[PDB]
């Protein structure tokens, strides 16, 4: 399963190993994200809370509370100063991480908010809801700028591209769609062979590819421009949950994903071979994230487990 890097690194394989277990959520963990400055990890959970943890030492930092119901997702602003969280209470909240205070409550979704992201500039927030819409929000004012009639089933993920000009969304309706941020126009619908639920979607770091999870135990890498599936990653278990997937780019080039058999799966991006399965969790691994500058994976698991874990690799 080795990958070619430079001279003397012809067969690179990651060696992720567990360094810290982060306990404190009292229900299912739903989402973990590293802040872009690499200092912190935020976690959101069904217990209504967000927790901030040190990214390198896993030291508990603070609890941020105020949502009336479970939280499905959380995301950092580009300057690591703010958080947005998506909740079952039908709102998003924008948070000052330093103070722990709720800056804004974004109201307009008429059903659970399931997924969120800031644009790279961080003047906008994108959200996906059980209400089947994608909304675009002004961070400074709290206004809903746009409501996109995006899908015909709950919206599972939303993500901006590298320059903020495009939004990708995914849904149980079997579609992955790409929206023009400025116009709200649907630019592309990507769908393959079959029509399995699309459980996760995100742009690659350069914004030229889209990684999509489908609930038939498959991850795919798509060329966005050409509308074509380029790689298929299989082996893991994913038939039920909206699991987060990642591009790992700090060392070797990997795809990293949680999985319903309690493992983190890591694949060689080029050859599609499985290169690592990470043990330690005792329930579905619902979330994974990849540190922005170090080879660090954060994982998180569902209600039977309740833990976040940090693993580190030499590549």
Curated annotation (Swiss-Prot):
Coiled-coil region list: none
Recorded consequence of changing residue 130 to A: Significant decrease in interaction with KMT2A
Outcome when changing residue 189 to M: Found in a patient with childhood apraxia of speech; uncertain significance
Entry-annotated residues carrying N6-acetyllysine: 93
Disulphide connectivity of cysteines: none
Impact when changing residue 206 to A: Loss of interaction with RBBP5 and reduced ability to stimulate KMT2A methyltransferase activity in association with RBBP5 and ASH2L
InterPro entries named in the record: G-protein_beta_WD-40_rep, WD40/YVTN_repeat-like_dom_sf, WD40_repeat_CS, WD40_repeat_dom_sf, WD40_rpt
Example GO biological process: skeletal system development
Site, Important for interaction with histone H3: residue positions: 88, 114, 244, 303
Alphabetical keyword list: Acetylation, Chromatin regulator, Host-virus interaction, Isopeptide bond, Nucleus, Repeat, Transcription, Transcription regulation, Ubl conjugation, WD repeat
Effect annotated for changing residue 114 to D: Strongly reduced affinity for histone H3
Any one GO molecular function term: histone H3K4me1 reader activity
Stated consequence of mutating residue 72 to F: Strongly reduced affinity for histone H3
Effect recorded for residue 28 to E: Strongly reduced affinity for histone H3
Spans of repeat WD: 24-63, 66-107, 109-149, 150-189, 193-234, 237-277, 280-314
Gene Ontology cellular-component terms listed: ATAC complex; histone acetyltransferase complex; histone methyltransferase complex; mitotic spindle; MLL1 complex; MLL1/2 complex; MLL3/4 complex; NSL complex
Subcellular location: Nucleus
Chief localisation class: nucleus
Glycyl lysine isopeptide (Lys-Gly) (interchain with G-Cter in SUMO2) crosslink site(s): 27
Phenotype when changing residue 114 to L: Strongly reduced affinity for histone H3
Role, per record: Contributes to histone modification. May position the N-terminus of histone H3 for efficient trimethylation at 'Lys-4'. As part of the MLL1/MLL complex it is involved in methylation and dimethylation at 'Lys-4' of histone H3. H3 'Lys-4' methylation represents a specific tag for epigenetic transcriptional activation. As part of the NSL complex it may be involved in acetylation of nucleosomal histone H4 on several lysine residues. May regulate osteoblasts differentiation.
Protein family (similarity comment): Belongs to the WD repeat WDR5/wds family.
Binding partners and assembly: Interacts with PAXBP1; the interaction is direct and links a WDR5-containing histone methyltransferase complex to PAX7 and PAX3. Interacts with HCFC1. Component of the ATAC complex, a complex with histone acetyltransferase activity on histones H3 and H4. Component of the SET1 complex, at least composed of the catalytic subunit (SETD1A or SETD1B), WDR5, WDR82, RBBP5, ASH2L/ASH2, CXXC1/CFP1, HCFC1 and DPY30. Core component of several methyltransferase-containing complexes including MLL1/MLL, MLL2/3 (also named ASCOM complex) and MLL4/WBP7.
Stated name of the protein: WD repeat-containing protein 5
